[PDB]
A paper describes a structure:
Bacterial transcription termination factor, ρ, is a hexameric, NTP-dependent 5’–3’ RNA translocase and helicase. A ρ monomer contains N-terminal (NTD) and C-terminal (CTD) domains connected by a flexible linker. The NTD comprises an N-terminal three-helix bundle and a five-stranded β-barrel, the OB-fold, that forms a primary RNA-binding site (PBS); the PBSes are located around one outer rim of the ρ hexamer. The CTDs jointly form a secondary RNA-binding site (SBS) at the center of the ρ hexamer.
We subjected SEC fractions corresponding to ρ-[name] complexes to cryoEM/SPA in the absence and presence of the transition state analog, ADP-BeF3. In the first assembly, ρ forms an open hexameric ring (ρA-ρF) bound by five [name] molecules (Rofa-Rofe), while the second assembly represents a ρ pentamer (ρA-ρE) bound by four [name] molecules (Rofa-Rofd). In the presence of ADP-BeF3, we obtained a ~1:1 (ρ6-Rof5:ρ5-Rof4) distribution between the two classes, whereas in the absence of the nucleotide, the equilibrium was shifted towards the lower oligomeric assembly (ρ6-Rof5:ρ5-Rof4 ~ 1:3). We built an initial atomic model of ρ-bound [name] based on the density for Rofc in the ρ6-ADP-Rof5 structure, which is best defined. We therefore focus our subsequent descriptions on the ρ6-ADP-Rof5 complex and on Rofc when discussing interaction details. In each case, [name] interacts primarily with one ρ NTD through its N-terminal α-helix (α1, residues 9–23), the loop connecting strands β3 and β4 (residues 46–50) and the very C-terminal region. In addition, loopβ3-β4 of [name] contacts the N-terminal three-helix bundle of the adjacent ρ protomer, presumably explaining why [name] binding is only observed between neighboring ρ subunits but not at the terminal subunits of the open ring. The N-terminus and helix α1 of [name] are positioned in a cavity of the ρ NTD between ρ helix α4 (residues 83–89) and one flank of the ρ OB-fold (residues 95–120). Surprisingly, although ρ adopts an open conformation upon [name] binding, the connector retains the NTD/CTD-interaction register of the closed conformation, presumably due to the direct [name]-helix α5 interactions restricting connector rearrangements. Concomitantly, in complex with [name], the CTD Q-loops adopt a conformation observed in closed ρ, but not in open ρ structures in the absence of [name] 42; in the closed ring as well as in the open ring in complex with [name], ρK283 is inserted into a pocket formed by the Q-loop of the adjacent protomer, while ρK283 points to the center of the ring in open ρ in the absence of [name].
Residue numbers in the entry:
A (entry chain B), C (entry chain A): 1 to 418
B (entry chain b), D (entry chain a): 3 to 84
The structure:
């Protein structure tokens, strides 16, 4: 039986499946324990078992394959990879290994890999000849990711407004600055819908850190890609682990000339988590933020690039401001001028119940001429001149009213001309 | 002629034998039995290779050509056909 | 009659009870001696005796069926349960077990379980195949808990204000921000009474941490539901062990499709208690609070969820702010955005003897659409559209009189229009 | 008929005797005294089962089919009939 489909099976069905095999008292233990118990019984029959996951190499030398279903959480169902296999096939952390599995033997508490037949969705002998991510050449974004869907729906207004303000291209390093109640979550969900609809080829990953347990559930329901999250009740080390697994997995896919998009929520919480784990260096900034603590999030955020060869890595990370914490202000200060794209949400517009609460004047992108055509860019400049005198609340109300009556951005530009 | 990689369990045992430098009993597909000391595991042109020496034989042979091996302290291991 | 009946029997009644049953001696002042003699006499006569309690599994391997009336405090009367019975019926910490009780043998310092009859108010056969709490999928709170008594009394005024300011739904993870002098205790009493009045079906539970014994006595008289508390004189380990007992029992009931409501006072003290018991990991945040210490309270707070299958857990906790200690405030900011519902209390409003002293401008829930109806949503939308432009202290004065002249919030909404 | 759970006292003693790996005398309806050995209790579908491996037939019998049992080492224990 395939392991990946076993984890996707609901726990209630596993109990029915487990009791059919004859296992007992499996209804009072966690789902990961149930999966491990079921596999051992099926392994006794001698049948082959197939598993897959994302490799994580511990400091000792051995590695574990962890599934994205449980957000790469350590558990009994994880597959042990011997240090010899990590050298037999040149494997780095984040590689997706698929192959046969064998039951644990005496002294072994985990399942073990048996025969690798797929690495990074490719043959094992072809995945050892891929140039490392660090050796690739960064470039400015030049391929446009169009959020507009064109269906004329009300939810499509957020995508259309986003295109006018801050165009997003492959390899962009975006940064969404949001006050606490500006509807940040709805903005991210709308972006994910556009990505999954307009660009089905791009690999979409959503990373949530210090998120409420109920918020994690809704994301997995309405996001067509892959959602990995760590709830706020987990240790700060767990927040670091999930972030490391996501970025390393994204890098491996880019080495195979794939477009990977990561929607991070939020860079502030991720930086705060690194502040706890990283040992003190003696230079403490205001708010208790260690100087070396911010180095790791910069590595995560700085990986967003447009590779000169095939493939790209897009990272759109939200930031939290005026939350009442001095630590948040310091973190946002260090990330102020590091992103190619900045999108500002305004609390004042959110108070008037006008969505999206986007501050048009303070939001834009660098080198936007590369993303868009000459004719479209010229029209965009005309719109900015009109918006510039108006205030933040006035501009958004004016913008949506002139945008609702048109079903496409191109039609809106033609109407605005006359 | 296409190389078929062996199972991970078999590779680990051979590498453990190579590190320990034990006098394994090697028999090939044709059935040629010989006792030599394992030295190291190497790969060339995406083909895994094993170098075993018996009284300075230092011969080189493919992994898939080996059918089974045994030791007084390590149980006999039969490699999978695929 | 049971061990619970004998324990809570009045002193005059039990003396009369012993005389008519033919007790050898009635001059034993300690109630522990007389109950032991009666139980032994019943046991040796062949009469069956039953008892009930809440299970607590110790790290040694066995457990003790603690009693909720004594706030789960250890005592010689706690029923002992062998580890064999725990593994036989798959018992977990927090399960309530009622059944036949065996008198102690030679060398047994506590009564030992004889036969289990009911587990979690259910037969043991059907209570050992319930899906674990961790496997349940969280959801947003959809069905709400109306707290409006609808009687017109001045006590209903506080409940009506809370209903408008922040609706409460089963599965909500609420927070109550309160300065030291803001009438926190009276607000908590009103909510507990309102829940019992409006929703007797939902299981009510109140937990008080680091509270004076006088407050504990009045809470038990007022609140109909079970009240468990720990006095300030007790050590910090008592606070830790009483909180875990409450949450563990709540989880077991939720697995039986039972809505459980927990009122916490206060989360700051509970977080403080965990700080002084957990070992230091070498990394200490500002204010002398260990970073790893806050992991345990977040586990307690993060358990509040609405279960898709059935049942829910609603935790409403009070966070103390500006108490003069910087440890309290740094703990509070760690719970800043971890709750669906928040409620602020203003010190200056309490100064003018105006109650409840809630801050309407800084109170509300994250998703009121699920809890409230469409017509109510607009009425609340209009009402907050009026309060927000003006101040907050005069807002409470505006609120109290307007609700006073009307009978029900529905009547209040229509009279505001036109 | 409907199955009934045994008390805690005999259940602990029965497991302890099995855990101690000592043969215990068992009697049936015919009154025969046999120093049989019970391995452990297997519970399937909330139904308890017992197997006796002393005779080698390892028959799976219910826990309600035993009249009484005793141990020469410790005091005799009587299972409650109701």
């Amino acid at each position: 039986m395939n392991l990946t489909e076993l984890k996707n099976t609901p726990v209630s069905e596993l109990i029915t499946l487990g009791e059919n095999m004859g296992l007992e008292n499996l209804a009072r233990m966690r789902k990961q324990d149930i999966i491990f118990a079921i596999l051992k019984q099926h392994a006794k029959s001698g049948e082959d078992i197939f598993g897959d996951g994302v490799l994580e190499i511990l400091q000792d030398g051995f590695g574990f394959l962890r599934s994205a279903d449980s957000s790469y959480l350590a558990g009994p169902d994880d597959i042990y990879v011997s240090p010899s296999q990590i050298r037999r096939f040149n494997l780095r952390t984040g590689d997706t290994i698929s192959g046969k599995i064998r039951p644990p033997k005496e002294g072994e508490r985990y399942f073990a890999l048996l025969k690798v037949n797929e690495v990074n969705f490719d043959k094992p002998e072809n995945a050892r000849n891929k140039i490392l991510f660090e050796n690739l050449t960064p470039l400015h974004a030049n391929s446009r990711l169009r959020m507009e869907r064109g269906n004329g729906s009300t939810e499509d207004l957020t995508a259309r407004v986003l295109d006018l303000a801050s165009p997003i291209g492959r390899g962009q390093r975006g940064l969404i600055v949001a006050p606490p109640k500006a509807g940040k979550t709805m903005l991210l969900q709308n972006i994910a819908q556009s990505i999954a609809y307009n660009h089905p080829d791009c690999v979409l990953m959503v990373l949530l850190i210090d998120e409420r347990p109920e918020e994690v559930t809704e994301m997995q329901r309405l996001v067509k890609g892959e959602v990995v999250a760590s709830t706020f009740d987990e240790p700060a080390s767990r927040h670091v682990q999930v972030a490391e697994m996501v970025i390393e997995k994204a890098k491996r896919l880019v080495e195979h000339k794939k477009d990977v998009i990561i929607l991070l929520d939020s860079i502030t919480r991720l930086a705060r988590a690194y502040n706890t784990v990283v040992p003190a260096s003696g230079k403490v900034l205001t708010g208790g933020v260690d100087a070396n603590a911010l180095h790791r999030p910069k590595r995560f955020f700085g990986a967003a690039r447009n590779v000169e060869e095939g493939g790209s890595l897009t990272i759109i990370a939200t930031a939290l401001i005026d939350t009442g914490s001095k630590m948040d202000e310091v973190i946002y200060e260090e990330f102020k001028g590091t992103g190619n794209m900045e999108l500002h949400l305004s609390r004042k517009i959110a108070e008037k119940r006008v969505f999206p609460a986007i501050d048009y004047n303070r939001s834009g992108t660098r080198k936007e001429e590369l993303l868009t055509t000459q004719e479209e860019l010229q029209k965009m400049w005309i719109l900015r001149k009109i918006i510039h005198p108006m205030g933040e609340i006035d501009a958004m109300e004016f913008l949506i009213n002139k945008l609702a009556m048109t079903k496409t951005n191109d039609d809106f530009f033609e109407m605005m001309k006359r | 002629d296409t190389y078929q990689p062996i199972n991970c369990d078999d590779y680990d045992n051979l590498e453990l034998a190579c590190q320990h430098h034990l006098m394994l009993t090697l028999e090939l597909k044709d059935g040629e039995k010989l006792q030599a000391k394992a030295s190291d595991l190497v790969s060339r042109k995406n083909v895994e290779y094993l170098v075993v020496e018996a009284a300075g034989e230092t011969r080189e042979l493919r992994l898939d050509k080996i059918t089974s091996f045994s030791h007084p302290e390590i149980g006999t291991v039969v490699v999978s056909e695929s």
